[PDB]
Amino acid sequence: MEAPAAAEISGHIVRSPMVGTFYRTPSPDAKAFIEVGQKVNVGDTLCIVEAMKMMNQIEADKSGTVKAILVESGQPVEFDEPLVVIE
DSSP: OOSSSSSOOOOEEEEESSSEEEESSSSTTSOOSSOTTOEEOTTSEEEEEEETTEEEEEEOSSOEEEEEEOSOTTOEEOTTEEEEEEO
8 A cells, every 4th residue: 555556667767778969848949748747658758869860759668757857958868878767
């Protein structure tokens, strides 16, 4: 009879599968892919990442709720590098 109780999910952590950059919005005066305090389901965008001289969107790989954004909009990322933390 706790947070988990059953099913169990355990927060996740988006690890830039490709070195480059990371973004949270398609623009400066644009909406945010993930609004802190929202839920995401497998198939919902979590953020973006710059690589291969082109934008690379990141779709949630496991439905969950925001947790904390380590990387910032535009901040560079590396391999096995943590980006966003989901719950």
